Amino acid sequence: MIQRTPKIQVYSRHPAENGKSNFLNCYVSGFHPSDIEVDLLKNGERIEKVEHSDLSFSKDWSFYLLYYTEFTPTEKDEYACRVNHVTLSQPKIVKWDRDM
Amino acid sequence: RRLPIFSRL
Amino acid sequence: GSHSMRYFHTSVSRPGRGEPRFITVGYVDDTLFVRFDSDAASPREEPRAPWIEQEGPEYWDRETQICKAKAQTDREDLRTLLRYYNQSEAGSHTLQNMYGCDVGPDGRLLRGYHQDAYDGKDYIALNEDLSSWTAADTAAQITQRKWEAARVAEQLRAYLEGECVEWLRRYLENGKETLQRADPPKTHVTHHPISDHEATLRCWALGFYPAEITLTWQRDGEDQTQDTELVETRPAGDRTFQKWAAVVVPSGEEQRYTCHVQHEGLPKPLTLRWEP
């Protein structure tokens, strides 16, 4: 069976400003099949009540989904997206970097 | 407004 | 402008864990406006944009009924595809369907679509004539034969040329505040040292609607297509989209590089450079 591994971006809704409330987004895309597991992390630990969009897909049939939650970036707090999928031998962690 | 037609494979 | 309406449908089997899950969403351009999920506690077609909320109860009943019927239909079709491809009943499989229409600024039909995929591979598509079929393999030729026998394409064409186009037009009018407003990207260039010898220049486009955009770097006026990292356009969560393009630049060459932005909310293409 043909499988396609997700592209992963973790980024904020507005440019990062320490002390300002924002949204942390994890967008996963280009993937098949559709089943996938996404966590948002704050200092290695899973953020609760993260929401996601409804399953849709691109012109090439590959799936996309957005996971998101409110956050207030600071200097020291580390954020990340943890993704698991059938094409991944282990979960992939992409670190949030406010310059990307 | 959705297509109300169903056609089995 | 030019506009489109699309309905997307995914059914995923999960043998041993109940019946397949059916999720479907409707878009006008890049605005989600309805959704149905068979795993919701009380599955109904639900509004997801303010300009659809004014449709009455009869709209919601009819749309919901269609979603439920296609949920069941897909379940039969997933069992058929197991036969057609000689597959065991133990695995999870995917059936996806997309249909809808494109109109031009005058509101006329530019293009209709109705296409299916199985396990992420094209299966059968209604050709652009809205009268003939493209089957991807011998399994899909069996469907094509049944659909040719039943004059299915004729029925699809009538929907696509009629109701598809007329309701899109209705939606475009009702959502004219948002659907017919293009938000231009807010653009800047940032500078990211990698080493003594080079630095990344990253051209950003933020807060733009709709999603379509071109972002390009040149060096001395030549496109740097092979040396540009272009990320996939991504949603901000507030209706708008984001995108950047980055090139690795040798120290002192920054002003030889220019970023080029085309978008429909820009009356003219932008040119920008890093500004220390």
Side-chain angles (χ1 to χ4, degrees):
Chain A
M1 303 250 309
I2 58 110
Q3 330 206 262
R4 291 160 90 183
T5 202
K7 303 184 194 73
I8 307 169
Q9 297 189 79
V10 50
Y11 58 100
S12 58
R13 182 177 302 179
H14 307 288
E17 196 167 319
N18 296 335
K20 175 165 213 184
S21 185
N22 208 314
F23 283 78
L24 183 63
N25 289 332
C26 190
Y27 185 59
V28 290
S29 70
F31 66 88
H32 183 91
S34 64
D35 279 342
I36 191 162
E37 179 174 301
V38 184
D39 292 312
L40 297 178
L41 309 186
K42 172 176 191 157
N43 299 310
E45 291 300 318
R46 170 169 204 230
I47 297 158
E48 304 189 341
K49 311 186 193 208
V50 175
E51 290 173 304
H52 56 85
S53 61
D54 294 310
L55 200 66
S56 194
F57 53 82
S58 275
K59 175 164 50 171
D60 69 2
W61 306 108
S62 73
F63 292 102
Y64 63 82
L65 286 171
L66 176 67
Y67 287 73
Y68 64 94
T69 187
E70 288 250 32
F71 89 133
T72 297
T74 55
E75 189 182 301
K76 53 165 191 162
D77 291 326
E78 298 186 329
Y79 290 93
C81 186
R82 184 162 59 198
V83 181
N84 202 4
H85 187 261
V86 73
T87 62
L88 288 183
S89 42
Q90 46 183 242
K92 170 69 182 115
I93 302 189
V94 182
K95 286 187 175 192
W96 183 60
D97 169 356
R98 62 183 71 213
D99 287 332
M100 260 171 81
Chain B
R1 168 108 152 179
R2 287 173 182 282
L3 175 69
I5 283 183
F6 308 106
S7 319
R8 319 303 208 275
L9 306 178
Chain C
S2 283
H3 298 288
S4 73
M5 182 163 76
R6 294 284 193 279
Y7 286 95
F8 297 88
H9 316 66
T10 309
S11 293
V12 181
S13 58
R14 47 177 169 198
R17 301 194 293 111
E19 291 305 312
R21 175 184 194 158
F22 177 66
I23 304 162
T24 170
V25 297
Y27 283 79
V28 164
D29 304 328
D30 303 322
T31 298
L32 175 71
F33 74 104
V34 288
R35 64 82 87 172
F36 179 104
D37 187 346
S38 63
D39 269 0
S42 313
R44 296 192 58 69
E45 170 109 301
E46 289 172 24
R48 285 287 183 278
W51 50 263
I52 202 74
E53 291 173 39
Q54 51 184 288
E55 300 300 338
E58 70 294 308
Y59 179 92
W60 295 110
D61 293 345
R62 181 202 182 260
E63 293 317 281
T64 294
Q65 145 269 144
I66 287 168
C67 284
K68 286 193 162 283
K70 172 147 175 74
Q72 296 305 301
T73 286
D74 270 15
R75 293 181 184 181
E76 182 174 328
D77 284 340
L78 282 160
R79 288 181 302 255
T80 298
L81 289 158
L82 292 176
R83 296 197 310 275
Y84 287 10
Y85 290 105
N86 311 128
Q87 294 162 329
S88 152
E89 275 156 60
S92 170
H93 296 276
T94 306
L95 184 56
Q96 291 166 268
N97 175 259
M98 179 283 273
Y99 69 81
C101 49
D102 296 344
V103 299
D106 72 308
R108 174 160 60 261
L109 185 68
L110 303 189
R111 224 286 197 193
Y113 310 88
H114 182 297
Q115 46 207 55
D116 289 285
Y118 181 59
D119 288 338
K121 295 146 101 149
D122 281 286
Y123 180 80
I124 193 162
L126 180 64
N127 291 331
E128 179 171 14
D129 60 7
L130 314 179
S131 62
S132 74
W133 295 100
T134 290
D137 55 33
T138 58
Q141 289 164 23
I142 307 305
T143 297
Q144 165 169 358
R145 290 170 195 171
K146 290 205 272 179
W147 283 6
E148 280 169 343
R151 285 189 180 285
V152 159
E154 283 68 7
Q155 297 200 263
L156 307 187
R157 169 192 169 173
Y159 164 80
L160 292 167
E161 286 191 313
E163 279 200 339
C164 188
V165 163
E166 288 303 301
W167 289 78
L168 167 56
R169 177 217 93 258
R170 171 204 187 109
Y171 299 155
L172 282 161
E173 175 57 22
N174 293 352
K176 65 171 165 206
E177 171 181 294
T178 49
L179 299 173
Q180 311 193 35
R181 181 180 82 250
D183 295 319
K186 305 165 194 146
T187 59
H188 68 296
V189 173
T190 51
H191 185 276
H192 307 271
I194 295 153
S195 64
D196 291 351
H197 325 278
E198 53 192 22
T200 298
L201 286 184
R202 178 164 294 118
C203 194
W204 298 86
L206 294 168
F208 63 88
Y209 179 95
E212 174 58 44
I213 196 179
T214 306
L215 268 197
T216 286
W217 275 108
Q218 300 168 10
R219 189 185 180 275
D220 307 342
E222 301 286 347
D223 280 274
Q224 299 298 283
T225 314
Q226 204 56 35
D227 300 287
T228 294
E229 189 185 353
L230 201 56
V231 302
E232 222 202 317
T233 300
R234 66 207 191 189
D238 62 11
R239 118 174 182 118
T240 73
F241 293 89
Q242 303 183 4
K243 199 176 190 79
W244 57 257
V247 277
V248 177
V249 175
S251 278
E253 299 206 349
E254 283 85 354
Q255 298 306 309
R256 297 166 73 168
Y257 282 83
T258 53
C259 177
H260 302 265
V261 187
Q262 299 177 56
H263 184 263
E264 82 163 81
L266 299 167
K268 313 210 213 165
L270 299 178
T271 294
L272 336 46
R273 286 165 160 96
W274 186 47
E275 309 179 305

